[PDB]
């Protein structure tokens, strides 16, 4: 026959190959597809879907309903944050459990902006003012409103609009931000603060909650398919 020469690689099975193989059932009448709604083209599409953050994973509150409830209590005007969250989507126990984070558990890198949406779930008749703030990678967690006020932030009026979206820009060093468990990866800081203190109408229960949603953006990507299962 045609002069041939077996080179290195022959007879080896590369799990990640892309070779053709003999069809075990010739001419089988395959049942054609039907356009069932909700096809998925890529995994990064699932992250762009808004998902509820379990902000309060306290000992009694983690793994139950209230892990998703952020209760505006009734404490001092002490700037002590009314929720702080490290934008270390993977290297922080809370963000890791959202659809966003779940996809972010199968790759080594991520790039792009994220957006934190909050839905106020408090009695219409009430008002006040809140401030959601961001703080780029590295900086100490801003502990006083005055500090948080300096970084990228939006004043979210309860009275006016129940929901508030605060996009976290892609402020980072490298082209691909590390999605692994690093010492102290940075890493934004989304945190709401009592701009004022909650105004209440006649006799409302005075304690209401806010929910939080996270999602990636069209500029969000992932590489080097990693894994784990047990």
């Amino acid at each position, epitope marked *: 026959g045609l002069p041939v020469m077996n080179t290195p690689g022959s007879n080896q099975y590369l799990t990640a190959d892309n070779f053709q193989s003999p069809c075990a059932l010739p001419e089988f009448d395959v049942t054609p597809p039907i356009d069932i709604p909700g096809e998925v083209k890529n995994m990064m599409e699932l992250a762009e879907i808004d998902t509820m953050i379990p902000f309060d994973l306290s*000992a009694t509150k983690k793994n139950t309903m209230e892990m998703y409830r952020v209760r505006l209590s009734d404490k001092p005007h002490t700037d*002590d944050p009314i929720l702080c969250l490290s934008l270390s989507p993977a290297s922080d*126990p809370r963000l890791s459990h959202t659809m966003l984070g779940e996809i972010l558990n199968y790759y080594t890198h991520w790039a792009g902006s994220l957006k934190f949406t909050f839905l106020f779930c408090g009695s219409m008749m009430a008002t006040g003012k809140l401030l959601v703030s961001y703080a780029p990678p590295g900086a100490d967690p801003p502990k006083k409103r005055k500090e948080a006020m300096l970084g990228t932030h939006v004043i979210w009026d309860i009275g006016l609009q129940s929901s508030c979206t605060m996009v976290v820009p892609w402020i980072s060093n490298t082209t691909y931000r590390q999605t692994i468990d690093d010492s102290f990866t940075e890493g934004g800081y989304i945190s709401v603060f009592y701009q004022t203190r909650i105004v209440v109408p006649l006799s409302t229960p005075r304690e209401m909650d806010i929910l939080g949603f996270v999602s990636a953006c069209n500029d969000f990507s992932v590489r080097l398919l990693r894994d784990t299962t047990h």
Partner: nanobody, 122 residues
Framework: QVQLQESGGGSVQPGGSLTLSCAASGYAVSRYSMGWFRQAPGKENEGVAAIDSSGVGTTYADSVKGRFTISRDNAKDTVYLRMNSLKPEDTAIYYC???????????????WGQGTQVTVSS
């Protein structure tokens, strides 16, 4: 990831004291801080003491202010809760947790604990 164990919990007496501690894992306590929450049986989580690791400046709840103390050692990887002048209300399910910092706020704490019960008026 990090699983810090609540140590020092025991049933003492009114007007008394008790030392508490939590040893690091997953990371060196020094980056995240550490604090304590005493969720009184049948009531919400109740903040008591918080301290920052790499920037020591303590914060206490007003209900326990003056009497209660908190300290840290980043070298022994443990956080030290000094509860002084303990009373009958101070009977709660205590908890230590790590957050950012140093800010007693129901949460703003990640990994918690198992729950150590200090029955002051025993």
């Amino acid at each position: 990831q990090v699983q810090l164990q609540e140590s020092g919990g025991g049933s003492v007496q009114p007007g008394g004291s008790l030392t508490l501690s939590c040893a690091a894992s997953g990371y060196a306590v020094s980056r995240y801080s550490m604090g304590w929450f005493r969720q009184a049986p049948g009531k919400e989580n109740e903040g008591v003491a918080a301290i920052d690791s790499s920037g020591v400046g303590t914060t206490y709840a007003d209900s326990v202010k003056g009497r209660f103390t908190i300290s840290r050692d980043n070298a022994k990887d443990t956080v030290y809760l000094r509860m002084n002048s303990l009373k009958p209300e101070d009977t709660a399910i205590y908890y230590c947790a790590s957050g950012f910092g140093l800010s007693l706020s129901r949460y703003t704490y990640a990994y918690w604990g198992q729950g150590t019960q200090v029955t002051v008026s025993s």
